[PDB]
Amino acid sequence: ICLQKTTSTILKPRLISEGVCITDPLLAVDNGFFAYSHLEKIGSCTRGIAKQRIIGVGEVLDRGDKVPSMFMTNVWTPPNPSTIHHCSSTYHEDFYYTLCAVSHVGDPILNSTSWTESLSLIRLAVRPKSDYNQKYIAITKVERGKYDKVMPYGPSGIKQGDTLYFPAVGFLPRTEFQYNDSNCPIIHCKYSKAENCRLSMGVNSKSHYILRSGLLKYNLSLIILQFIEIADNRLTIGSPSKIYNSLGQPVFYQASYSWDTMIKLGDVDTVDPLRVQWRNNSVISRPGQSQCPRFNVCPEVCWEGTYNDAFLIDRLNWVSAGVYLNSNQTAENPVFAVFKDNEILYQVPLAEDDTNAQKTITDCFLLENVIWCISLVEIYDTGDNVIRPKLFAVKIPAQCSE
Amino acid sequence: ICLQKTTSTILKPRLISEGVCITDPLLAVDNGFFAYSHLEKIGSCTRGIAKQRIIGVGEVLDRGDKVPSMFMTNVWTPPNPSTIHHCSSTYHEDFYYTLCAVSHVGDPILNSTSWTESLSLIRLAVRPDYNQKYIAITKVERGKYDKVMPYGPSGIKQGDTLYFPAVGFLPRTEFQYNDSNCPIIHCKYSKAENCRLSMGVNSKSHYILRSGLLKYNLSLGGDIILQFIEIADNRLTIGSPSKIYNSLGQPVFYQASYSWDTMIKLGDVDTVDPLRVQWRNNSVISRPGQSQCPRFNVCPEVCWEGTYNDAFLIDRLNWVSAGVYLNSNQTAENPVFAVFKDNEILYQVPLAEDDTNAQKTITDCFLLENVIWCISLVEIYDTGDNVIRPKLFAVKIPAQCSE
Ligand SMILES: *[C@@H]1O[C@H](CO)[C@@H](O[C@@H]2O[C@H](CO)[C@@H](O)[C@H](O)[C@H]2NC(C)=O)[C@H](O)[C@H]1NC(C)=O
Ligand SMILES: *[C@@H]1O[C@H](CO)[C@@H](O)[C@H](O)[C@H]1NC(C)=O
Ligand SMILES: *[C@@H]1O[C@H](CO)[C@@H](O)[C@H](O)[C@H]1NC(C)=O
Ligand SMILES: *[C@@H]1O[C@H](CO)[C@@H](O)[C@H](O)[C@H]1NC(C)=O
Ligand SMILES: *[C@@H]1O[C@H](CO)[C@@H](O)[C@H](O)[C@H]1NC(C)=O
């Protein structure tokens, strides 16, 4: 692995795959296998009617070209696509377990007061055999502490033994939320007031719940899910997030849907309860809107941002890789970057300038002992009004050659 | 490759993956890629209405287990599955092209008087209009023949010229046959004219069937054309589902034995225009049959009956070939993978239990990591259930004749 800053486009991404939009996408990659999901909506990606959800699993293989390829092996379609939301998948023992939420009022985040917190599970098999292939589970027993209702809320989690750990969130009513507004860091911020951080824990300032991210534990040995909650350090609103394991040490990514826009990732120290030692990263941020744009550090009352995760290639030098959007206040300019917290080593755009691309999921691995990365980017066609997930594969160079 | 007869099951097959039946299956395998097709019928496989027809291509790959696997990459469903019939596929330059017949009166073979000849082509890209192109073929040159049609699972390429297995429907009023050539030398009960009446479906069928090729040339890309090629008189047998394929750089032909000549019909093609095959005088491998033409029959009788059970030439110098055959004189059952010679079965392995019923078998072989592997589509039945499902067995051909 190259560890040297250069402006050379040594990276070469290779794309590897009527009136509708393909949205709410999922990507997990583990030990040769992968899981993906999306929602086919007819019309507006934010408000369109649902056409069909799919969840699939498959294998990650190379051909003679020693380039990874997606090969779907197992696919499930729910008989109603209007009801499945916020799927998260973790891989254990030749099976991929996709934990979804069920709703009759739409997205549990936006009509959150009204949602009876129904969960479920879909286990699909990475290699099908002619219920091994496909099992559904209506989860009924959930342990969530003070939280009024919990929910998975991220693309992928991890296994530890027979215990899965999905990225999840808890909706704690803000009457019971414990926060000293003295801790809200407005020391250098002329504009910031004290209570923003607390009002920044929900969708509205007058949202009824706050959101706190964490994990959902599922111990296969024993079936019951246990909500775990994220540590106070660097506390921001419950957001789509992802736990994954690199080099045998687990790492957490939280998307930055509120004022703290610099990227939130770092090694998890403990998993019960969830403590992450966040990186002091000063180069990778997120595109916001008018109120909380890229690189903002001052506590304001906003909910806005896009999930653009990254993945840790080298621990000792902490080199990491992800697709980020190089736009302040807009979803334009997708870019694949390999970076260090105070420095960006090298990059390559993945589109043209006005290209709009809202979300990016990124998992990396060894293909024949070469470090490759698969990135899902929610790119739009130039005419637009359609979001189509596009999968780029990118080899991480070992030399810093020409 | 082993070349020593043994009763040892050194062969080890590995299966490699609402109210319906999966019938009329297709398999082609070429240079790492594969084509498959089937018809999903609701109910009786013979008389059932059809739900879906899938024409797919994909890649044949191994994982860490060094075993081949199917990986679908491109799939097409026609908007009406009641109208598509007898597809055959050939692979050229990153495109797999499948040639189908179109009918509004059902299977052209069984209602040939009422069938207008309509032909269509589907090209699928094996690594995705590049992905999927349809063509309604309008220009066909068929010589004396009243109507032609593809009739087999796969054919071969030569340059930009594809060669699909096909059949021609020549009305028997224009068929020229000296019944003196009908070989009844040793055959007590066998009359002279059977061979002639044996060239159709009925004795009183209005057409006969003659197998051959359809030639499509890419080089002359303008417009659409298709030229029927008939087959050499030697070992003439009714036009039947057949397959041309290339092994070791020489093309080989397999014709199914749907009439009295029940011993297997295969061998190297000498020429391609017009179609001459030097058939093997093969004495160990025959085809299950109904009462009139039981397996191992060699006497000319008036029958039309048999199952397509092809073989593949693993080794030309010793003519070692591999195929699945049905071990049943008068029933379709007892599917058994065999590797065999002209006058000797070398070694075998059953692929199911004794009553297991398996109507059809397609067999293509290749090198996976420089080892001789074979894929066999076997159209088997799920135990008690009537419905048929195609099952794909992968079988490694041993080089040593070990334990
Ligand atoms: C397929 O079509 C081409 C037509 O271009 C045939 O070969 C060419 O024929 C044209 C004249 O029709 C010549 O200009 C070229 O020199 C020919 N190229 C050759 C012979 O290589 C081609 O032979 C046809 N294939 C078959 C099997 O008939
Ligand atoms: C899962 O349950 C078994 C059953 O007693 C237990 O031994 C194991 O520790 C559990 N896994 C955990 C708690 O992570
Ligand atoms: C985005 O915001 C930061 C901080 O306010 C600023 O440095 C940067 O220049 C802004 N974007 C552009 C395009 O100038
Ligand atoms: C043959 O075609 C005729 C006339 O179109 C039709 O009535 C009959 O059902 C067909 N026979 C079949 C499909 O066996
Ligand atoms: C099938 O027929 C041949 C010769 O007509 C005979 O040798 C063979 O034994 C028959 N099969 C059975 C099961 O008897």
Author numbering:
A (entry chain A): 188 to 204, 213 to 325, 329 to 420, 424 to 603
B (entry chain B): 188 to 204, 213 to 323, 329 to 603
Authors' description from the paper:
Leveraging structure-guided design, we introduced a single amino acid substitution (S586N) in HeV-G to reconstruct this NiV-specific epitope on HeV-G, which generated the HeV-GS586N mutant. Utilizing X-ray crystallography techniques, we successfully generated high-quality protein crystals and determined the crystal structure of the HeV-GS586N. At position 586 of blade6, the nonconserved amino acid S586N was the closest to the 14F8 interacting surface. Compared with wild-type HeV-G, the single amino acid substitution caused the top of blade6 to shift toward the center of the receptor-binding surface by a maximum distance of 9 Å. The substitution modified the local molecular framework to elicit relative shifts in the adjacent amino acids Asp585, Thr583, and Gly584 and changes in the solvent-accessible surface area. Therefore, even though only a single amino acid substitution was introduced, the protein conformation was significantly altered, which can explain the strikingly different antigenicity of the wild-type and mutant proteins. Although Asn586 was not directly involved in the interaction with the 14F8 antibody, shaping the molecular framework contributed to the formation of an immunodominant neutralizing epitope. SDS‒PAGE and SEC demonstrated the homogeneity and purity of HeV-GS586N, HeV-GS586N existed predominantly as a tetramer with a minor dimer population, whereas wild-type HeV-G comprised a mixture of tetramer, dimer, and monomer states. Functional assays and immunogenicity studies in mice and non-human primates demonstrated that HeV-GS586N elicited broad neutralizing responses against both HeV and NiV.
